[PDB]
Amino acid sequence: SIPLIGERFPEMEVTTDHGVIKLPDHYVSQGKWFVLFSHPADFTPVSTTEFVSFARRYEDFQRLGVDLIGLSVDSVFSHIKWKEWIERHIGVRIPFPIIADPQGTVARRLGLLHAESATHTVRGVFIVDARGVIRTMLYYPMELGRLVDEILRIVKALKLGDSLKRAVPADWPNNEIIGEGLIVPPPTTEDQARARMESGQYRSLDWAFSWDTPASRDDVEEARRYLRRAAEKPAKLLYEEA
Template sequence: MAVTLGQKAPDFTVNSTQGPITLSNYKGKWVLLFSHPADFTPVCTTEFMAFSESYEDFKKLGVELIGLSVDSIYSHIAWLKDIKEKFGVEVPFPVLADLDKEVATEFNLLDPKVGTTVRGVFIIDPNQVVRWMIYYPAETGRNIKEIMRVIKALQFNWTNKLATGANWEPGDSGIASAPGTLKDAIAREKEAGAERWYLKRVKV
C-alpha cells in the first residue's frame, strides 16, 4: 500500500550519488524527499539548480534534501556533472538511484504509463511521519518558495501546537484548535483573539 499523509514513512536503503542512504538514519531531522521524471530533462534541470541554489536556506531550517528517480547511479553522476560544468551549479544533496523502483512504489511516485517517477514532494518530520505530499505535472516546475513556506508552517505547528491559516507567512498569528464541546465553545467567544467560537488567532 502506498504511503498516505500522516503515516510513518516507509524505511529504505538505496544507493545514491553520495553512497547508500537509509531513511531511518535521518530520524530527528526534517527531510524533503522529492522525485523527478528523468535525468537530462529540461524542467528537472531547472528544479535541481533551484533546489541547489536554496540549499543553504533549507539547511538553516534543519531540512535534509534527498532527490530520487529510477535512473541509474551513472546517469545521475553524469547529469550532475553536466549541471556543474554547463551551468556552474553544484548539486550538494544526494540523489537516489531507485532502479528497482521500490521507493517509488512505496511513495506512489511511479507513472504507470511510462514507468518513470512523477514530480512529487514529501516533507517528513523528525518522527519520520509524512506531513505533506504534493504532485506536479511533468510540464510544471515546482515553486521552491512555496515548499519552504510549507516547511516553516509545519515547523511552526510542531513548535507551537498551532495551525496556520490561508497564506500564512512567518510572523503571522497561529490558529488555535476549535473547541469540542458546547461549554468550551461558549467560553471561547470570551477569549482574547477569538473572532468566532471556532476561530481564534494566537500571536506567538
C-alpha cells in the first residue's frame, strides 16, 4: 500500500490553506505535474528556507507545467500564520497550498513518519506526472534541507525522456561519458541486439549502449541553468534586506 515509483498517486481528499482538493485528480484534470513535499513543522527554520527556495523557483515550475503542494501535520491556521510571517519578514509570498494533516492520515498513507520523529513527517518529495503516476521519491531528514534545483532537473530530464523516448544518463546534461547525450533503451532480444549493431543509426560503445543528441540547445541549457543557480554563491542574501 506504501507508494512506489510507477504506481498512480494514492487517491485521497485533503484540506489545504486554499481549500479541499482530491489528489491526484485536481492536477491530472489540468494536465499538470505536481511535486508534493512534506516538512516536519510550520515555524521551523530549515522548513522556512525550503518554502522560500520553492517560492523563488515557482516561475521555473510553472514553465515545466508543474504545480507545488506542501504537507505537514499542522493546522490550516498555523499554515496561514506561517505564510503571513514569511511574506512579512523575508518578503516572499508562498503562492502554493500546504496540506493540513493534524491526525497524520496523509502522513501515514504516504509513509512520511520515520524513526527521527514520532509526530512530524520527514522531508519527503513525490514527483507526480500529469497521468497521476509517481515518477521519483526523495526522503530528506529533519537536520538537512533539500536542493530544490535537483527537483527541477528531475522533472525536466523526465519530460525530455518521455517526449524523445530516451533514458537520461548520470549527471545529465553534464554526463562524463556522453555529455548532453540521451540514451536509447537497450535491445532485450538477440534479433534487436543484431539490428542495433548493424544499423549505424546511433553512436554506440556496445549493443547495449547507444545514444544520440535529440534534445534542443534550449532544453539542454535550461537544465544546466538549474545546476548553475545551485552552484552560484548568492548575489545578495535575503537576511540583509530583512
